[PDB]
Amino acid sequence: MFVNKQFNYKDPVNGVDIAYIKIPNAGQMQPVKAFKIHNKIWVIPERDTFTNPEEGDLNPPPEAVSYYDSTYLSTDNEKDNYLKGVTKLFERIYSTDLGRMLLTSIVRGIPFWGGSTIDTELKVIDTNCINVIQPDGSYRSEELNLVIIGPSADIIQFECKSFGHDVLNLTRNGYGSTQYIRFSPDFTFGFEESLEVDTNPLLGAGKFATDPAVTLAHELIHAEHRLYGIAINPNRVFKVNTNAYYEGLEVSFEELRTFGGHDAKFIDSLQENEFRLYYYNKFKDVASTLNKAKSIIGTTASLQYMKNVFKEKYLLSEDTSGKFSVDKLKFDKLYKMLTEIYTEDNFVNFFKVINAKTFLNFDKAVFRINIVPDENYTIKDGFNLKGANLSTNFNGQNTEINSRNFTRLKN
Ligand SMILES: [Zn+2]
């Protein structure tokens, strides 16, 4: 039971799990009503005009596969439906053995306390917190790992972003940072079934719809990489040979890794090893820092407690002297888990749903949906409901047969 509380958008703020909050480096934004659905995880049912200054408007630009609608997610009823949809997709993910593991890793992935210039001092990094406004008007600083928020101007432009430090590369130095996922459970993408020799022939018809749970899981996978600070520099790309009418189509390693399956292998053995050794060295640096720590600032939590928190996050070894170190095989297990086990491909297999076979199989259309009603979608079966006739040949994802659950919007 990932979310052990029924949340309704209109419930009164209580300063604990329902509250008006303020995001870091947000200039001066007005507070926004947010909900804490699980330890370290909040949801803001608002269009994202806070994380980025240059994107503080929901106005359509000169366009370029995108979708715009400045009125989307503007009403309380919409925010309530949004909140319910996100919550439901989390339960769907959490209900699988793979999803339970990923979310556990995410919750244990507290961004590192590496904000001090004094090496014998442990200190938090402010951008890894939110200010929770209380009933009396005061604000409480609270640390969090994950925030799910609505999309910015481009409604279907989902992504995992974070604030970053002046000098440190939090998502790539092993530290990690609070992750903000722009996402919407109100839309999903359509993809065409690649007719292959050995693929089920009884497949309903034309377009199939992506299970929004796979989409969220995909983003949660990026978030896990970023929380453990082992994300691959977005600069590292593979030049995919698409056409002969193209002397080039870049796809980043971070993406190929996240999608997993056959595409992940485009990251050769030399590069894999390179990344693994690099982060292993980075975890060792975290160990040293913890060892040289004698005091903790922003006091409340004890020093040994915070050290334990990170000993647990990085699966560090501790001897009788109380000194931490990185165990090669524990590191390998953790690293493998975060990069090879948690993948969109493995989720598609656990969920047993149809999905694009590779990024190469680019989606075609954008559909409007509503997974909240059980008559439409359930935690256990997605769109492919049991008693229904939709539980056969993925009829539930067939946007022709299950025409009532999908409303074409673009392309
Ligand atoms: Zn991605």
Side-chain angles (χ1 to χ4, degrees):
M1 336 58 234
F2 200 64
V3 183
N4 264 77
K5 201 175 185 194
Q6 172 194 183
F7 281 111
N8 294 299
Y9 190 76
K10 293 177 179 172
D11 294 329
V13 299
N14 51 38
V16 181
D17 53 19
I18 298 186
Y20 278 95
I21 71 176
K22 270 137 62 188
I23 287 178
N25 220 55
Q28 58 187 180
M29 57 150 263
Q30 264 183 168
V32 296
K33 194 171 183 172
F35 306 73
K36 186 174 181 173
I37 61 167
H38 195 90
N39 180 41
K40 307 301 193 165
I41 307 178
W42 295 72
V43 178
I44 301 166
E46 297 282 329
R47 297 293 294 282
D48 180 17
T49 54
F50 314 108
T51 75
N52 183 60
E54 306 167 68
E55 296 189 301
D57 69 85
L58 298 181
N59 315 164
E63 291 177 359
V65 57
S66 65
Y67 181 60
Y68 298 84
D69 173 13
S70 67
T71 67
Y72 169 57
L73 198 57
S74 61
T75 67
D76 274 27
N77 285 323
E78 283 178 287
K79 298 178 179 175
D80 181 62
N81 193 56
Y82 175 102
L83 184 55
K84 268 76 165 65
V86 165
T87 282
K88 189 156 178 182
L89 292 186
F90 265 97
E91 299 294 348
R92 180 151 164 70
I93 293 169
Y94 195 65
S95 72
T96 68
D97 178 53
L98 191 63
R100 194 198 67 235
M101 293 181 93
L102 172 58
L103 289 171
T104 292
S105 299
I106 283 179
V107 172
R108 284 163 57 100
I110 294 83
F112 190 63
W113 271 46
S116 173
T117 42
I118 302 168
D119 68 304
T120 187
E121 192 187 73
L122 231 39
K123 180 181 186 173
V124 77
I125 288 177
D126 288 49
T127 54
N128 294 324
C129 310
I130 54 173
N131 280 147
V132 183
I133 303 168
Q134 299 305 293
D136 74 303
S138 55
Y139 26 41
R140 184 184 73 224
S141 190
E142 187 180 309
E143 291 180 71
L144 69 182
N145 295 4
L146 185 67
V147 174
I148 305 298
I149 193 169
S152 191
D154 178 15
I155 292 173
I156 62 175
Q157 174 66 186
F158 304 163
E159 62 166 287
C160 201
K161 61 213 300 293
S162 46
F163 288 103
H165 189 276
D166 260 308
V167 306
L168 277 28
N169 292 294
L170 300 182
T171 65
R172 300 193 298 273
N173 77 340
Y175 285 16
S177 59
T178 301
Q179 296 308 295
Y180 285 70
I181 294 176
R182 285 174 167 172
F183 173 79
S184 170
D186 300 314
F187 305 93
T188 195
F189 317 87
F191 61 95
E192 210 180 306
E193 244 300 354
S194 298
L195 53 161
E196 296 196 298
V197 180
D198 91 326
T199 59
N200 185 159
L202 302 179
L203 286 183
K207 281 194 184 63
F208 282 100
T210 295
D211 186 316
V214 169
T215 308
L216 182 63
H218 174 92
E219 294 305 307
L220 288 177
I221 291 175
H222 283 307
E224 55 127 303
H225 296 164
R226 296 163 73 83
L227 282 164
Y228 284 77
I230 60 169
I232 310 181
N233 199 316
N235 89 58
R236 303 296 281 265
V237 301
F238 184 99
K239 279 75 178 181
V240 183
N241 180 43
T242 292
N243 258 314
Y245 314 141
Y246 276 100
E247 197 178 11
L249 194 277
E250 303 188 322
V251 182
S252 75
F253 282 5
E254 182 54 31
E255 288 299 339
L256 301 171
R257 161 174 288 178
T258 303
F259 182 93
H262 175 274
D263 300 323
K265 302 304 177 192
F266 284 172
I267 296 171
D268 75 312
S269 184
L270 266 31
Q271 239 96 213
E272 257 308 312
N273 287 336
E274 180 184 355
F275 302 142
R276 198 179 65 265
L277 252 286
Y278 182 84
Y279 288 116
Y280 170 68
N281 187 71
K282 285 303 190 186
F283 275 36
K284 286 195 281 180
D285 289 348
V286 170
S288 293
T289 295
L290 288 172
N291 290 329
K292 302 159 68 179
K294 302 302 177 180
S295 66
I296 192 166
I297 313 301
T299 285
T300 342
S302 73
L303 175 61
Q304 196 182 59
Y305 174 81
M306 284 308 296
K307 281 194 178 192
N308 267 84
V309 165
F310 294 119
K311 158 185 180 183
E312 285 193 52
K313 171 177 178 183
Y314 301 102
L315 301 191
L316 300 177
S317 271
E318 166 176 39
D319 60 34
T320 66
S321 300
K323 182 171 67 181
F324 296 139
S325 75
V326 177
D327 194 298
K328 234 299 179 189
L329 61 78
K330 299 185 78 181
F331 171 80
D332 282 349
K333 175 174 181 179
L334 177 57
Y335 190 86
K336 173 164 186 287
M337 196 158 65
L338 296 168
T339 65
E340 278 181 48
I341 295 187
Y342 306 155
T343 63
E344 178 173 329
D345 191 60
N346 282 317
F347 268 103
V348 169
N349 285 353
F350 265 78
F351 285 140
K352 292 281 189 174
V353 291
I354 191 175
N355 196 75
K357 285 296 183 62
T358 167
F359 72 82
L360 222 312
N361 187 176
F362 296 78
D363 54 59
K364 328 305 289 294
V366 186
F367 297 84
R368 161 59 77 109
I369 62 180
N370 191 341
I371 61 173
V372 177
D374 288 337
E375 307 63 53
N376 289 355
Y377 184 107
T378 60
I379 290 169
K380 271 55 185 298
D381 314 313
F383 289 114
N384 305 316
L385 306 178
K386 299 183 178 190
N389 82 105
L390 301 172
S391 72
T392 288
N393 301 301
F394 312 106
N395 283 324
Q397 287 176 265
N398 195 306
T399 68
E400 305 277 57
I401 297 181
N402 199 22
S403 51
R404 58 191 308 296
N405 270 286
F406 307 102
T407 300
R408 207 117 167 294
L409 293 178
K410 217 276 220 308
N411 284 85

